[PDB]
Amino acid sequence: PLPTNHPTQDYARLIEKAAWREAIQNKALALASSRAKREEILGIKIMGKDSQPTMTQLGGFRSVLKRLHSRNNRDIVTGYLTALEQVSNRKEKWSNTSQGLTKIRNLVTQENLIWNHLDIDFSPLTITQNGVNQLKSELWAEAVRTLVDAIIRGHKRDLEKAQEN
Amino acid sequence: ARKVTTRWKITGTLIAETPLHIGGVGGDADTDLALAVNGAGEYYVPGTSLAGALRGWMTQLLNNDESQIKDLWGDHLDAKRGASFVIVDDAVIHIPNNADVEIREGVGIDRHFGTAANGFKYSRAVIPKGSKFKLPLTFDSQDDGLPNALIQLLCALEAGDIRLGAAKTRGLGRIKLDDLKLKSFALDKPEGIFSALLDQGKKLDWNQLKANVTYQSPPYLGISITWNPKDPVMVKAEGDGLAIDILPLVSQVGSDVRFVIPGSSIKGILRTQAERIIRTICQSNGSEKNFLEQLRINLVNELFGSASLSQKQNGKDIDLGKIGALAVNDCFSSLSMTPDQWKAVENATEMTGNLQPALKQATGYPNNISQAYKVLQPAMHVAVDRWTGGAAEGMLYSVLEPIGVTWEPIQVHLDIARLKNYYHGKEEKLKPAIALLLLVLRDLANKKIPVGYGTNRGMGTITVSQITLNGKALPTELEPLNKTMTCPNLTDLDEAFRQDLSTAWKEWIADPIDLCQQ
Amino acid sequence: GRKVYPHHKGLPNGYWSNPTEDRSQQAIQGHYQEYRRPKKDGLEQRDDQNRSVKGWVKPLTEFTFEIDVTNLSEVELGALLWLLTLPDLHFHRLGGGKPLGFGSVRLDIDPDKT
Amino acid sequence: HNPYNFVPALPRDGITGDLGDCAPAGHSYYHGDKYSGRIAVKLTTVTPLLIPDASKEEINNNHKTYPVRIGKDGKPYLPPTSIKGMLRSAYEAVTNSRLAVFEDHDSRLAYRMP
């Protein structure tokens, strides 16, 4: 790895983000391609024709996650989840998920957890010393958004195979 | 090397006068169409995209003469032209303050059901408005002086006539040049070559060349509509709020947020009424067609545009796509807020709690909830269960109705030159498209076209108090369009002109051929 | 079936008049002031079961609105126009407080603007 | 009289024509046989009309006081949604359509023994 003071450290860091971003994206595709991995990460599942929760409830969450630009915005998503949880009829909309409301709470509030789900080995993808710690602190919110977007797309397109018969 | 009598460095600030979208390969997990970014990840205008914007405009200015275009922009195949004499650099975009990119929602509305067509739900990342980027232009002159066509180009930039990026008809792409500077280096001579190396060049007074020339603005018609909302008007924001479920869409307009009616929205309502008129006359149903087929009907394909779609006709291969001659610009309110004042509203949690200060702040009436709520009014709505009365479980929702937001005029731009090209030069073929457009404006003025969210549900009715038709270099028989209309029924246009249009309109109705087929 | 709030026919003169007065306990012309929460011990019963209103739209006030209709058949249109041309003393019920007599309205068409 | 009653929702199997279930006319064009246009309506109040503005509701001891909802000219803003829901429920009744808002109602209700 480059010495931290090295003059090409700035340029190298542009190469790193690119390699990390595209790695996160490709892994999010793979993880979203299986229904067991979608249920593990968000609790989202198919029950015959039915989606747990309905796609409208996933769209509501996904519309709030668009506001997760940084970890200073995780209060926005935790605001949404507490409001959802505080309304009994909306909470019940998420029963028969595999604990999906708390899985969302965790992913938004445990910074390591997106990386645990992605489980990318970033060593082939970093060259700056302290590259992994800084890029994880930098790309966290984008990784969360990227994984949930992929999961919800793979969910809906597996739902279409069960629903459109 | 290549001989250069004088090298010119032409530079200034280009400002986004509307939002902007140059696309990369596409899609960033937050937008289906993602902005182009340089290797540093900064939003930028590719010099390719600006070169073709300026070459394209110049191609229309110079009546598509290949000779003078290739004299300035080079040619791969002529044996004496090769490389371009205009260098266009990649220019990074400085979004004002550090405003983030906006995401703009899009939907196709099924023409039979009047509702979002399946699959036709999309989003585009757009550069705000007010954002600046460099005009990175260099010109190597072999002739003496500076070309007239290049002076005309710089005039069009300062006029704001060139459009850049995607969605040019659907709201986006307007740029304006400010602070144009011309630096000249006589690379043909010792003193000018050393000036290139050391002295940063001779400053030319642009105003002197700007005086030597008249700006040859191409034929266009511009329609500006003055509307006040009769019933609240608002496009829905991208997602449900906390204290208010349904909030108006806002955009960054400089350092402030304003309420926006996307031009994509004004164009889809105008297109929908335009198509409904055409289908009504031909008695042509839209229920069996899919949404891409529903859109594709005569006159609107030229005015509003059609999707690119290469089709083998018979051996010959033809693009059915054409850009819209009709372009609509996003509309903005008289009413602006600081980016945090609106966040105070979006992040309010109790309608009678912290929302009240947020709306009092954002409306500019911090001490008059009454005056504040004559501008932005929260409205509660219930669905009432039909056996019990009361309210249906869960079916309680709230709208922030912009009951008293004041809006700017809607600005439509008809590229008469683009239409005339579709009609292969025949100015007589313009009259049905003009007649349609005036019929669409008659309906708009008569409240027949509601705009935005909730049109059937207490919102979206507009009052049109003035339409100003203001075309430039119009063909002589279309010149009676140059009128400020205030009667909704077009009776401010000369009756002999409305009868002439009606005659050509009726001639087309009698045989509604594809008017750009020849 | 569909729950409806029949018009409160025959409410006497001054029934809605001076509504702050607790006339709930006298049969003025045979009706009690049924829309108003009675006082208890001479004090207002502004409990959290009832609401209160700072005012209301007066009777005999008039609103104009427009209906824009698309592709109505003659049955679908005739059903609508029947509601908008009901004979005299037919009244629609609107807004809130309908069990208490509020929101009885007369709808009729303005033909010159149709 | 109880202040509510019901309008029988007769079952609609075998109902035909414009009162039946039908494919919608649609929005793509004005059908030669089907009417479109503007209807102008006069609405006049017979009893007072409550138009509570819940955005400006004020609370003491959990009791809510509502002002009248007013527009940008200070006249009462009667919402078109409130008109539409009155009109729709009246329309559904006299046309005998499907009931547009039926909540779940899928649990058995409960009662008490004598």
Side-chain angles (χ1 to χ4, degrees):
Chain A
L2 291 177
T4 60
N5 68 321
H6 193 67
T8 78
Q9 184 254 111
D10 287 340
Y11 184 61
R13 179 54 57 77
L14 281 311
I15 322 309
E16 288 182 312
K17 288 188 73 173
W20 277 51
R21 281 175 158 147
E22 89 96 31
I24 292 158
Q25 290 163 11
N26 295 352
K27 190 56 172 285
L29 256 165
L31 289 171
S33 77
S34 74
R35 78 212 318 268
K37 282 296 178 182
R38 292 193 297 273
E39 193 182 337
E40 183 178 27
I41 298 161
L42 299 187
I44 266 55
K45 59 171 172 174
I46 303 291
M47 300 211 303
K49 267 64 180 177
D50 305 315
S51 178
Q52 265 56 52
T54 63
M55 290 301 315
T56 299
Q57 292 293 318
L58 295 174
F61 167 49
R62 186 168 156 263
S63 304
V64 171
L65 203 76
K66 256 68 188 294
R67 305 187 67 200
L68 188 70
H69 298 295
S70 158
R71 59 172 168 283
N72 81 280
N73 311 125
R74 71 172 46 134
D75 195 19
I76 307 302
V77 194
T78 297
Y80 169 81
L81 290 159
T82 53
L84 165 47
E85 178 172 39
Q86 285 164 358
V87 183
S88 177
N89 296 318
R90 314 215 301 126
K91 193 181 184 187
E92 293 177 350
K93 238 69 178 59
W94 286 77
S95 73
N96 307 321
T97 62
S98 174
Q99 309 302 331
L101 292 188
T102 65
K103 281 179 175 165
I104 296 164
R105 188 71 62 102
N106 296 349
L107 187 66
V108 166
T109 60
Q110 296 177 15
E111 195 173 36
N112 304 291
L113 184 60
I114 183 56
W115 308 119
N116 293 359
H117 291 311
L118 285 173
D119 206 10
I120 303 158
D121 179 10
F122 298 109
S123 316
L125 309 176
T126 191
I127 35 173
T128 304
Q129 175 182 348
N130 305 324
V132 182
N133 296 341
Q134 293 177 356
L135 290 161
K136 283 187 172 175
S137 85
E138 174 77 322
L139 298 176
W140 174 82
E142 184 170 344
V144 174
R145 283 184 272 116
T146 300
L147 185 57
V148 171
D149 181 73
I151 281 173
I152 293 177
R153 187 179 296 99
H155 177 50
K156 210 270 170 169
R157 299 205 189 197
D158 279 350
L159 178 63
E160 285 172 6
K161 300 184 186 76
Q163 187 183 265
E164 312 313 320
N165 293 335
Chain B
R2 181 184 260 187
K3 194 167 181 176
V4 178
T5 285
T6 290
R7 174 171 286 173
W8 292 87
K9 294 230 185 161
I10 298 140
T11 195
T13 300
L14 292 168
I15 310 88
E17 291 301 331
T18 60
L20 254 169
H21 182 94
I22 301 77
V25 184
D28 287 345
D30 288 345
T31 58
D32 304 303
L33 299 119
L35 289 164
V37 292
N38 69 5
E42 303 168 300
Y43 300 118
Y44 87 133
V45 185
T48 47
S49 72
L50 183 63
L54 304 183
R55 176 175 183 151
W57 183 92
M58 260 183 56
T59 304
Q60 297 294 83
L61 170 79
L62 304 177
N63 314 309
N64 317 78
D65 173 33
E66 305 92 339
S67 64
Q68 287 163 101
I69 296 295
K70 296 174 170 202
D71 288 354
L72 282 99
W73 298 94
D75 192 22
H76 50 319
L77 309 163
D78 186 22
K80 295 188 178 180
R81 275 184 276 218
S84 175
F85 289 87
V86 193
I87 300 140
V88 201
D89 301 305
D90 291 340
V92 162
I93 299 171
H94 303 298
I95 311 194
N97 68 97
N98 293 300
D100 184 29
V101 174
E102 293 177 350
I103 292 82
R104 277 280 185 85
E105 297 293 330
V107 76
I109 300 299
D110 188 295
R111 301 298 192 245
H112 185 244
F113 303 99
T115 67
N118 289 337
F120 293 88
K121 174 67 254 287
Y122 65 93
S123 62
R124 186 185 296 278
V126 307
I127 293 280
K129 154 180 174 164
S131 302
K132 297 181 177 176
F133 60 103
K134 187 173 179 171
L135 176 66
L137 290 174
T138 329
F139 178 66
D140 283 314
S141 201
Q142 297 200 318
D143 42 309
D144 197 11
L146 190 69
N148 185 288
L150 189 50
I151 295 167
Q152 294 289 352
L153 180 78
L154 295 169
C155 293
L157 286 171
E158 288 208 317
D161 289 344
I162 303 190
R163 295 208 179 207
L164 184 67
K168 287 178 292 302
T169 60
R170 327 183 289 260
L172 270 45
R174 193 187 177 202
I175 62 171
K176 191 210 181 286
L177 177 63
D178 288 325
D179 304 354
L180 175 61
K181 293 161 287 176
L182 304 175
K183 297 305 188 80
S184 173
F185 310 90
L187 300 200
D188 219 26
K189 300 184 182 171
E191 305 86 350
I193 192 66
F194 288 123
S195 181
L197 296 167
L198 296 168
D199 306 334
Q200 299 187 11
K202 182 183 292 186
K203 175 67 178 293
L204 180 61
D205 292 337
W206 172 236
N207 297 75
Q208 189 171 355
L209 297 189
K210 193 63 167 69
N212 288 357
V213 85
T214 298
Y215 174 40
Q216 187 177 354
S217 59
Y220 84 90
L221 173 69
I223 316 111
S224 64
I225 306 129
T226 301
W227 62 290
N228 54 90
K230 177 66 166 291
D231 293 301
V233 166
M234 65 159 259
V235 171
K236 211 216 173 188
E238 67 292 323
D240 291 4
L242 297 182
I244 295 289
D245 303 286
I246 295 139
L247 287 165
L249 188 68
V250 278
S251 252
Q252 294 273 4
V253 182
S255 62
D256 268 20
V257 283
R258 288 185 175 271
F259 288 120
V260 66
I261 301 278
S264 284
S265 282
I266 315 152
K267 190 187 186 201
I269 69 183
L270 294 175
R271 186 186 183 115
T272 296
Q273 192 67 10
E275 292 171 29
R276 184 180 296 134
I277 290 164
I278 297 288
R279 287 191 285 257
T280 296
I281 283 164
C282 306
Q283 298 281 54
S284 179
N285 201 297
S287 60
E288 75 290 337
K289 292 179 180 75
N290 69 82
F291 176 73
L292 287 175
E293 263 62 73
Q294 288 174 343
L295 289 173
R296 207 192 304 107
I297 80 174
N298 284 334
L299 301 180
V300 305
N301 294 332
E302 307 98 276
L303 282 169
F304 297 96
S306 51
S308 286
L309 172 57
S310 52
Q311 297 289 23
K312 295 279 288 187
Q313 185 173 21
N314 183 19
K316 182 181 182 176
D317 188 341
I318 55 169
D319 191 17
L320 277 51
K322 69 205 72 184
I323 194 165
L326 195 155
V328 203
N329 280 1
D330 307 17
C331 187
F332 280 111
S333 39
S334 289
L335 177 64
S336 73
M337 298 153 286
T338 70
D340 44 84
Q341 277 171 344
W342 185 246
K343 255 52 182 162
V345 186
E346 298 201 308
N347 266 74
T349 54
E350 295 299 328
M351 177 180 290
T352 58
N354 53 20
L355 183 76
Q356 281 179 3
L359 291 174
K360 280 190 291 181
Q361 292 281 357
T363 60
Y365 293 97
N367 306 89
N368 282 304
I369 187 172
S370 60
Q371 303 297 356
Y373 285 5
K374 286 172 174 178
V375 178
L376 294 175
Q377 193 168 97
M380 274 288 192
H381 300 145
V382 282
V384 177
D385 171 280
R386 295 294 190 260
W387 292 261
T388 60
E393 187 74 5
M395 308 302 168
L396 180 61
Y397 64 107
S398 59
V399 187
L400 187 72
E401 294 193 340
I403 183 61
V405 174
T406 286
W407 294 85
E408 94 183 3
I410 301 168
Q411 300 281 337
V412 187
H413 177 252
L414 176 68
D415 192 339
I416 295 290
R418 185 54 57 59
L419 275 187
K420 188 178 175 185
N421 294 11
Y422 300 146
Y423 306 144
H424 305 288
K426 297 183 180 287
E427 307 88 346
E428 186 172 16
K429 267 67 185 177
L430 292 167
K431 298 184 182 182
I434 303 302
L436 176 66
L437 179 57
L438 284 169
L439 294 170
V440 178
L441 296 170
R442 190 172 74 193
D443 284 359
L444 189 71
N446 278 281
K447 314 190 294 191
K448 277 172 166 282
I449 317 177
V451 53
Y453 194 65
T455 61
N456 262 17
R457 306 191 307 288
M459 290 206 299
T461 321
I462 67 174
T463 301
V464 162
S465 64
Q466 172 180 333
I467 302 184
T468 289
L469 294 157
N470 176 59
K472 305 297 295 187
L474 294 180
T476 54
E477 59 203 316
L478 294 186
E479 198 163 329
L481 290 169
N482 283 339
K483 199 78 71 175
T484 287
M485 310 192 296
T486 61
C487 177
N489 296 342
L490 314 175
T491 69
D492 296 307
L493 289 167
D494 304 33
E495 190 178 43
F497 176 67
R498 284 183 291 127
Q499 191 162 342
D500 183 37
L501 285 188
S502 300
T503 305
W505 181 233
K506 289 180 175 192
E507 288 169 6
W508 187 79
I509 289 170
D511 183 15
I513 57 153
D514 303 24
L515 202 58
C516 53
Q517 188 166 15
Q518 188 160 236
Chain C
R2 321 200 170 69
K3 183 159 155 178
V4 296
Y5 297 89
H7 167 67
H8 292 218
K9 185 174 180 182
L11 297 179
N13 304 90
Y15 186 78
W16 308 103
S17 74
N18 187 29
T20 51
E21 186 179 40
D22 53 296
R23 301 190 301 285
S24 59
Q25 294 300 320
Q26 166 62 342
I28 176 59
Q29 297 289 82
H31 296 61
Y32 305 90
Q33 190 199 24
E34 201 62 45
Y35 62 84
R36 194 205 196 270
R37 184 81 170 106
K39 288 180 185 164
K40 187 74 181 87
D41 311 344
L43 53 72
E44 296 291 7
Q45 285 198 106
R46 297 178 198 281
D47 61 59
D48 66 343
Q49 298 301 306
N50 76 117
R51 65 177 62 195
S52 181
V53 296
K54 303 193 178 185
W56 56 48
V57 170
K58 295 170 181 179
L60 313 177
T61 58
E62 189 161 81
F63 300 77
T64 309
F65 70 94
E66 293 171 74
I67 312 180
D68 167 61
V69 303
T70 295
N71 295 326
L72 300 195
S73 63
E74 299 185 26
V75 171
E76 290 159 323
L77 180 65
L80 179 62
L81 298 176
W82 188 64
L83 296 166
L84 303 172
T85 64
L86 295 169
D88 297 301
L89 312 178
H90 287 47
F91 302 115
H92 286 279
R93 309 299 310 272
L94 182 61
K98 297 183 291 305
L100 310 179
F102 297 108
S104 194
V105 308
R106 159 46 55 163
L107 301 188
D108 57 88
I109 293 175
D110 272 353
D112 53 334
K113 301 193 71 173
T114 296
Chain D
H1 299 274
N2 186 66
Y4 66 90
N5 245 106
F6 303 80
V7 164
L10 310 181
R12 316 191 309 104
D13 192 16
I15 300 295
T16 57
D18 295 311
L19 298 178
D21 290 354
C22 191
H27 292 277
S28 312
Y29 73 111
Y30 302 113
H31 293 199
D33 58 313
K34 300 184 168 66
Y35 291 86
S36 312
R38 193 76 57 67
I39 303 155
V41 183
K42 260 172 175 59
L43 181 164
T44 186
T45 58
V46 181
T47 64
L49 169 70
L50 310 184
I51 318 179
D53 197 348
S55 75
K56 292 179 57 182
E57 70 182 31
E58 285 182 325
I59 305 99
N60 294 87
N61 64 250
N62 203 41
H63 171 88
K64 297 180 180 290
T65 308
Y66 293 89
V68 174
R69 193 176 174 192
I70 55 160
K72 54 175 163 178
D73 71 337
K75 289 186 193 62
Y77 181 98
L78 172 55
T81 48
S82 286
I83 302 186
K84 189 181 183 188
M86 161 194 75
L87 237 175
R88 187 179 182 142
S89 64
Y91 195 88
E92 290 177 60
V94 307
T95 209
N96 192 58
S97 65
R98 294 170 178 278
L99 290 94
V101 186
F102 197 29
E103 60 191 324
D104 288 358
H105 295 290
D106 60 355
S107 60
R108 274 70 79 147
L109 289 178
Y111 67 99
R112 294 206 63 90
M113 263 65 191

